[PDB]
Design a protein around this ligand. Structure first.
Ligand SMILES: CCCCCCCCCCCCCCCCCC(=O)OC[C@H](COP(=O)([O-])OCC(O)COP(=O)([O-])OC[C@@H](COC(=O)CCCCCCCCCCCCCCCCC)OC(=O)CCCCCCCCCCCCCCCCC)OC(=O)CCCCCCCCCCCCCCCCC
Ligand code: BCL
Ligand code: BCL
Ligand code: BCL
Ligand SMILES: CC[C@H]1c2cc3[nH]c4c(c3C)C(=O)[C@H](C(=O)OC)c4c3nc(cc4[nH]c(cc(n2)[C@@H]1C)c(C(C)=O)c4C)[C@@H](C)[C@@H]3CCC(=O)OC/C=C(\C)CCC[C@H](C)CCC[C@H](C)CCCC(C)C
Ligand SMILES: CC[C@H]1c2cc3[nH]c4c(c3C)C(=O)[C@H](C(=O)OC)c4c3nc(cc4[nH]c(cc(n2)[C@@H]1C)c(C(C)=O)c4C)[C@@H](C)[C@@H]3CCC(=O)OC/C=C(\C)CCC[C@H](C)CCC[C@H](C)CCCC(C)C
Ligand SMILES: COC1=C(OC)C(=O)C(C/C=C(\C)CC/C=C(\C)CC/C=C(\C)CC/C=C(\C)CC/C=C(\C)CC/C=C(\C)CC/C=C(\C)CC/C=C(\C)CC/C=C(\C)CCC=C(C)C)=C(C)C1=O
Ligand SMILES: COC(C)(C)C(=O)C/C=C(\C)CC/C=C(\C)CC/C=C(\C)CCCC/C(C)=C/CC[C@H](C)CC/C=C(\C)CCC=C(C)C
Ligand SMILES: CCCCCCCCCCCC[N+](C)(C)[O-]
Ligand SMILES: CCCCCCCCCCCC[N+](C)(C)[O-]
Ligand SMILES: CCCCCCCCCCCC[N+](C)(C)[O-]
Ligand SMILES: CCCCCCCCCCCC[N+](C)(C)[O-]
Ligand SMILES: CCCCCCCCCCCC[N+](C)(C)[O-]
Ligand SMILES: CCCCCCCCCCCC[N+](C)(C)[O-]
Ligand SMILES: [Fe+3]
Ligand SMILES: [K+]
Ligand code: NA
Lengths: 281, 302, 240
């Protein structure tokens, strides 16, 4: 079935691989070569998880957990039930994610729109790859990666953070959080603003973007505008994930002590390190 | 190198836009501020005008008083030495009364009384600012979505500093005013309550916080990708759907099998963000009032 | 236990919220259709919401959604397969016919208005007080298409008055007539404006506007769809 306005857009072309071989839809879903790829990678990865479940023992979603190879295996292969299933599933997952992104590119080309969406998705992929590939490789073992289980991967977050004390003190982590919080603030405001214009007090006429600029100038003295707010949301969200990947790629590699102690470089600056009083004097 | 509409190529400026009037008391609007060519590479170049009625002056006065109360305490802790002030800035902290004082106001100035004065100022600043968000919308005939969304953030704030301390019986439960110290409080809160990762409202709060970045990345990228068809003129696309709104919808239908409308995506947006602090404030309010240990609670409830 | 009641209540609220949100997002494009335009059999598990009515400003009327959907224009496409789900081939020139990435919607054939009731978008020469304030001024630059040939020259900027931004470049062609080019589809360089989407020979086919001092929503959709269509359909003429 098609949206009422959809048929005029369903023309041939835009594929990156395979010509017209996979240029078609299944219900709402566009396929393309990278739709076939995504299906293959995601099917096998899910198959191995369904398998790696019984080599572990269970069939409950809250307990199934595919752990990576122990550190002793270094960066090498591992027996299926001892971490090789995790390694293959991780290759499948990367294959599924990158294939999803390239299928998005094909959809962009057929629709004549810009590539901003798969470009943005690529930041999430790179954050994933930082935790499962770039950081383990720089640290020397797949065992530093996180396990694939709903609650076990939280265990990994807690264990990894507390290896460095209170992980709050990671400065790149502080920047990442500021972007996450500000993004959610900007999302609430944006959604509320458009809606307050499109759904004004009862019986009144729809407001205009002029009313939107006016509301925010009245409120805080500035309005970023309707183009800018979308630039902003995209930039805040990508910036958060950028500093997330950054705060982890540097942890256990160039910095591996307690993050709270990193801040001494500021306290011990020559011109105030030995002035008495305050907290550190 | 195709243009991507991240940064403006050519800025244009005209007479300063003094805004829509509707029922706004024009006497309380400033004049227009400067124009920032710097901002104009990204958003609007125009600063101001701002509306500053009585409620606004009250709120801005409390807000600075709250900020100044903290900062005067910081100068005291620094021994009035400016070099100490800058060196230890993140280490200073204005802390609430000790538990022995309970919910009383009898605590000595240097031992929680100053925290209570600063917090009182903060309470007045935030709630009067909330009234501003309602009133400025009302004056313009607009819906009250911004004020209702703001109330969701106020919820978590009220829970952390006011509702939960009151229900726990002492001001000592509240958050101190300091950069590092309020981080220490946050880590401590989790340890004392058996690890917030077992609090289901905390996990939901994370889903919505991650979800807000996912969604604004999706939406912000989508609008820029269709801005070549006027996509960001969203109110008129709601009133009279264009090819921008259709291509946006069909990108997501073809990608993930369903899609939004130009209006409805802003309902996803407002709710995704609002549920961060809504569920979060529930998770905090339940902690130590009803559940002392989320690990223990989870062993018995799932 | 109070926490366990709160988390149970919440999942019920969230299911109701998602139902509301999904049905809200069905106020356009629904009911679904077969490729031949008849109502599809499978509409999904969500019913259409109760209609709402938007009251448009400046006597423009109202919009009630959901409501009877119609394309209100001919679509020059034909099936390429005997079953559902395959592409539909243009029956003529898809840039001229406005299909595929060259599509346009039959929006109102009036200009968008600002909050005071004036035309939102005006050529800068007719916009009192408006001037380039930063960046390279494009007026006067030659315009180069993706075949690396010159297609014309910039003679003005069309600006959004209430939001104070450039929305189109007005480009004069060899025959003396002009066309609008979307600002998001041109690259302003020091010595030219480059347009990757179109070869020089396709600039004449850009849909024209009726009035030299205003552009209607319908005209903007035809302009923007046409220019974006060239990315796919001008690729045989796109060098490098
Ligand atoms: C405890 C936590 C305490 C937290 C305190 C803070 C609470 C913050 C609330 C955040 C609200 C933001 C919502 C934005 C919004 O859309 O406002 C609509 C609307 C905009 O107001 P307006 O400007 O007058 O609009 C005029 C327009 O013509 C009309 O404007 P419009 O058309 O845009 O608005 C229409 C809107 C109208 O919205 C509302 O009326 C407000 C609804 C708020 C609900 C809050 C829920 C909190 C979640 C708790 C969950 C349980 C935890 C335990 O429609 C909806 O939003 C529907 C909501 C979704 C329904 C979900 C049903 C769930 C149950 C399903 C059961 C079945 C499950 C099967 C299994 O605001 C209101 O209608 C009143 C809101 C008052 C909220 C404050 C209440 C304080 C107490
Ligand atoms: C006790 C625990 C420690 C701590 C330890 C850590 C550790 C350890 C890490 C973080 C990381 C992060 N922490 Mg910390 N953290 C703490 C306290 C906090 C607090 C707080 C209020 O106290 C906050 C707000 C944060 C915030 C954050 C973010 C900056 C970041 C998580 C987002 C991210 O990386 O996304 C990036 C996004 C992704 C990885 C998602 C990728 C998705 C992929 C591409 C696609 C998936 C598709 C899926 C399979 C599809 C399924 C099918 C469909 C559903 C149909 N931390 C404490 C002090 N924190 C993490 C980080 O930065 O990672 C880089 C991290 O590793
Ligand atoms: C990002 C930084 C940390 C980390 C820290 C945390 C913390 C801390 C928490 C979570 C939480 C969750 N995380 Mg995690 N998480 C990480 C990496 C991942 C990856 C990944 C491939 O990289 C995935 C798929 C997930 C998935 C999940 C969900 C199980 C859950 C809600 C997330 C959400 O709504 O996000 C926003 C995205 C959306 C709203 C879109 C929908 C996404 C759906 C829900 C994803 C489902 C994946 C499915 C369960 C598993 C794979 C299915 C495949 C078919 C096999 N996390 C890294 C290691 N994550 C929370 C939780 O409750 O955990 C139990 C929580 O508190
Ligand atoms: C070791 C630390 C603990 C932990 C302890 C806590 C505690 C404690 C809390 C959270 C909370 C949250 N945590 Mg946790 N958290 C941990 C691990 C994580 C990880 C991770 C990857 O490990 C993540 C992603 C998170 C993520 C999150 C967020 C989802 C949530 C806060 C939402 C928000 O927007 O707050 C930011 C928004 C606000 C505070 C609202 C503020 C509103 C007011 C009105 C603003 C006033 C402005 C004032 C006047 C100043 C004006 C400034 C000038 C105008 C410039 N936590 C670990 C397990 N976390 C909160 C929560 O809800 O938990 C359920 C919370 O209280
Ligand atoms: C970079 C900014 C944010 C971002 C952006 C972003 N994400 C995106 C996009 C964009 C722009 C898309 O276009 C794309 C999309 O289609 O969204 C609907 C996507 C998307 N982001 C998603 C999830 C997601 N994004 C997240 C985060 C973020 N996404 C960032 C915060 C998170 C978390 C944890 O924060 C999650 C869970 C999907 C809904 C979707 C990508 C779907 C996809 O790749 O589909 C192909 C793959 C499959 C259908 C299944 C593969 C299965 C694997 C082979 C096996 C499982 C492996 C996995 C490692 C197991 C993990 C277990 C967990 C318990 C840890
Ligand atoms: C729904 C969840 C998200 C949310 C939503 C939200 N927040 C909101 C709103 C909404 C919908 C508003 O409408 C409202 C607003 O107006 O935004 C523009 C607000 C807002 N959220 C704010 C902050 C905020 N929101 C946050 C978070 C979130 N907000 C959530 C993620 C956070 C954090 C911790 O993550 C913060 C810090 C404000 C920008 C604003 C509320 C403003 C307010 O209450 O102000 C009262 C205080 C004053 C008027 C004055 C304070 C004075 C300052 C302390 C300055 C001191 C410095 C100055 C330069 C002094 C001079 C000194 C020098 C001489 C040294
Ligand atoms: C203004 O514009 C805009 C719209 O439009 C008008 C939009 O819609 C959207 C889109 C946004 C929404 C609809 C809001 C809701 C979205 C979220 C809250 C984000 C989270 C979304 C999900 C959790 C759903 C994810 C589901 C996925 C990843 C797809 C499910 C996959 C399948 C079941 C099949 C996958 C298909 C394959 C394998 C490829 C090939 C197909 C074969 C079958 C072969 C945005 C951003 C937008 O801004
Ligand atoms: C250069 O120095 C000068 C003097 C110019 C300065 O001004 C310097 C200023 C500073 C250095 C300011 C420094 C300020 C900070 C570091 C602020 C840090 C604050 C935080 C990190 C806030 C964290 C969370 C705060 C919360 C959750 C507050 C909750 C507040 C309550 C909800 C309010 C409750 C009200 C109460 C308890 C009073 C009750 C009494 C009644 C009568 C109702
Ligand atoms: C969030 C950004 C805040 C920017 C605040 C800008 C305020 C502009 C008001 C300036 C007043 C100009 N004038 C002439 C009346 O003084
Ligand atoms: C508070 C004064 C109100 C109006 C002042 C406007 C300042 C704009 C300055 C011109 C901007 C151009 N410049 C030089 C920054 O590129
Ligand atoms: C302007 C503050 C409004 C009153 C609310 C806070 C009360 C302050 C209590 C400080 C205690 C002073 N004293 C004398 C008991 O030490
Ligand atoms: C309005 C958008 C709706 C998105 C809903 C996201 C659901 C994520 C579920 C995460 C599970 C959290 N928890 C606590 C049960 O573990
Ligand atoms: C809720 C978190 C993860 C949800 C899983 C993905 C949701 C399925 C949405 C796809 C529906 C497409 N469909 C059925 C209309 O074709
Ligand atoms: C949490 C995000 C996922 C929510 C799933 C929303 C519903 C997806 C199915 C919509 C059906 C589309 N359809 C077939 C009616 O057109
Ligand atoms: Fe938007
Ligand atoms: K002029
Ligand atoms: Na039709």
């Amino acid at each position: 079935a098609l949206l009422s306005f959809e048929r005029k857009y369903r023309v041939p072309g835009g594929t990156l691989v395979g010509g017209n071989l996979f240029d078609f839809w299944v219900g709402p879903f566009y396929v393309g070569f990278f739709g076939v790829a995504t299906f293959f990678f995601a099917a096998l990865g899910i198959i191995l998880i369904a398998w790696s479940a019984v080599l572990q023992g269970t069939w409950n979603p809250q307990l199934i957990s595919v752990y990576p190879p122990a550190l002793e295996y270094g960066l090498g292969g591992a027996p299926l039930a001892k971490g090789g299933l995790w390694q293959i599933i991780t290759i499948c997952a990367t294959g599924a994610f990158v294939s999803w992104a390239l299928r998005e590119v094909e959809i962009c080309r057929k629709l004549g729109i810009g590539y901003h969406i798969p470009f943005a998705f690529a930041f999430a992929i790179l954050a994933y790859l930082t935790l499962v590939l770039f950081r383990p490789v720089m640290m020397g073992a797949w065992g530093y990666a996180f396990p694939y289980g709903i609650w076990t991967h939280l265990d990994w977050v807690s264990n990894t953070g507390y290896t460095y004390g209170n992980f709050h003190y990671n400065p790149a982590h502080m920047i990442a959080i500021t972007f996450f919080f500000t993004n959610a603030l900007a999302l609430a405001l944006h959604g509320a603003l458009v809606l307050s214009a499109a759904n004004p007090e009862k019986g009144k006429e729809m407001r205009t973007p002029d009313h939107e600029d006016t509301f925010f100038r009245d409120l805080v003295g500035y309005s970023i505008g309707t183009l800018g707010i979308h630039r902003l949301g995209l930039l805040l969200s990508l910036s958060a994930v950028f500093f997330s990947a950054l705060c982890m790629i540097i942890t256990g590699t160039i910095w591996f002590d307690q993050w709270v102690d990193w801040w001494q470089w500021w306290v011990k600056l020559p011109w105030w390190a030995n002035i008495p009083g305050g907290i550190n004097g | 190198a195709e243009y991507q509409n991240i940064f403006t190529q050519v800025q244009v400026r005209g007479p300063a836009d003094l805004g829509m009037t509707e029922d706004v008391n024009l006497a309380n609007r400033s004049g227009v501020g400067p124009f920032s060519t710097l901002l104009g590479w990204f958003g609007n170049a125009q600063l101001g005008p701002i509306y500053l009625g009585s409620l606004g002056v009250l709120s801005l006065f409390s807000g600075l008083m709250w900020f100044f109360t903290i900062g005067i305490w910081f100068w005291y802790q620094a021994g009035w030495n400016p070099a100490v002030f800058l060196r230890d800035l993140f280490f200073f902290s204005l802390e609430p009364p000790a538990p022995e004082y309970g919910l009383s106001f009898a605590a000595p100035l240097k031992e929680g009384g100053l925290w209570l004065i600063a917090s009182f100022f903060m309470f007045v600043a935030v709630w009067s600012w909330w009234g501003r968000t309602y009133l400025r919308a009302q004056a313009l005939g607009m819906g009250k979505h911004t004020a209702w969304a703001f109330l969701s953030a106020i919820w978590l704030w009220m829970v952390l500093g006011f509702i939960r301390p009151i229900l726990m019986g002492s001001w000592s439960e509240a958050v101190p005013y300091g950069i590092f110290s309020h981080l220490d409080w946050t880590n401590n809160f989790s340890l004392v309550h058996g690890n917030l990762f077992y609090n289901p409202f905390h996990g939901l709060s994370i889903a919505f916080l991650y979800g807000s970045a996912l969604l604004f990345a999706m939406h912000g990228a989508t609008i820029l990708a269709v801005s070549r068809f006027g996509g960001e003129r969203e109110l008129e696309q709601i009133a009279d759907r264009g090819t921008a709104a259709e291509r946006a919808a069909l990108f997501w239908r073809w990608t993930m099998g369903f899609n939004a409308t130009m209006e409805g995506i802003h309902r996803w947006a407002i709710w995704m963000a609002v549920l961060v602090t809504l569920t979060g404030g529930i998770g905090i309010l339940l902690s130590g009032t009803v559940v002392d240990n989320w690990y223990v609670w989870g062993q018995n409830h799932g | 236990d109070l926490a366990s009641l709160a988390i149970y209540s919440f999942w019920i609220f969230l299911a109701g919220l998602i139902y509301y949100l999904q049905t809200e997002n069905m106020r356009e494009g629904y009911p679904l259709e077969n490729e031949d335009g008849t109502p599809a059999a499978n509409q999904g598990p969500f019913p259409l919401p109760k209609p709402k009515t938007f009251i448009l400003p400046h006597g423009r009327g109202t919009l009630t959604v959901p409501g009877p959907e119609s394309e209100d224009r001919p679509i020059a496409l034909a099936r390429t397969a005997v079953s559902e789900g395959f592409p539909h081939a243009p029956t003529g020139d898809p840039m001229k016919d406005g299909v595929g990435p060259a599509s346009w919607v039959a929006r109102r054939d009036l200009p968008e208005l600002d909050g005071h009731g004036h035309n939102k978008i005006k050529p800068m020469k007719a916009a009192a007080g408006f001037h380039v304030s930063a960046g390279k001024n494009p007026i006067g630059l030659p315009v180069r298409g993706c075949d690396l040939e010159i297609a014309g020259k910039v003679v003005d900027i069309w600006v959004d008055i209430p939001e104070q931004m450039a929305r189109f470049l007005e480009v004069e062609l060899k025959d003396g007539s002009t066309r609008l080019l979307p600002m998001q589809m041109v690259k302003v360089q020091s010595n030219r404006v480059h347009v990757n989407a179109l070869s020089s020979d396709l600039f004449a086919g850009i849909p024209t506007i009726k009035s030299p001092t205003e552009v209607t929503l319908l005209e903007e959709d035809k302009i923007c769809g046409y220019v974006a269509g060239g990315l796919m359909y001008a690729a045989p003429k796109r060098k490098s």
